[PDB]
Structure 1
């Protein structure tokens, strides 16, 4: 797809919420554990994501994720539109299970699993910077 397209979804694990952003063209992932599955957490996460990468459009598998006033406000300010042109969430949950006993906190296992996914082979982390630099 286009180099500005990202997909955001939440998954549940251990009674906690993991927000997962996937750069669609590359397979590169950012993820965080958030306390509540709310618009404000999504909005804040979008602000962080857009200061780091050139985010043009965002997609989701649960469209009601984006009806927040706060989400719309974050997308407005960062100049993000909704992607209309369109499972690495399962692989990530798989890597988390593989490392989970290595960490006390779930959020630590998540970041270990993001690390492994992005540097596993080129890797998704190498592909994203090549795609963005070329563009």
Structure 2
């Protein structure tokens, strides 16, 4: 599938909000514990994302997430469009579960789990980390 498609959603765990972005074509993840599930947090996260990867369109499973003028301003500025028409959210949460006692804060456990997931070779042998980079460079060259 297309190299500029991302999925963005918020799970909850321990009374906190985890924003999770998946690079659809590769399965690569960025996630962030956010204080509140708001347009401002989402806008900000999108700007961070877009400055790091070529982000053409973003899908979500909660469309209402994308209605705030704040979010609209961020996709306007970065040049992003919504997607209208895995779950890595289960798996990520499987991994957080495993590493939870290795860290005091949920946020640290999240980043441990992002790390584990992104490196883990899918022997059949690339990792998600290796695939996104290969796909985006592939698509340069």
Shorter-chain TM-score: what band?
A: over 0.9
Offset from partner CA, 1:9-67 (integer Å, 9 cap, x none): 00000000000000000000000000000000000000000000000000000000000
Structure 1 pair 72–125 and aligned structure 2 pair: CA distance change class (3 A):
same
Offset from partner CA, 1:77-132 (integer Å, 9 cap, x none): 00000123491111000100000011000000000000000000100000000000
The TM-score with structure 2 as length reference comes to: 0.94
Report the count of equivalent residues: 135
Unaligned runs of 5+ in 1: none
Counterpart in the other structure of 2:93: 93
Distance 2:114 2:65 in 1: 22
Cα RMSD after superposing both structures: 1.2
Distance 1:25 1:113 in 2: 20
Distance 1:31 1:83 in 2: 19
Give the stretch that moved more between structures: 78-87 or 39-48: 78-87
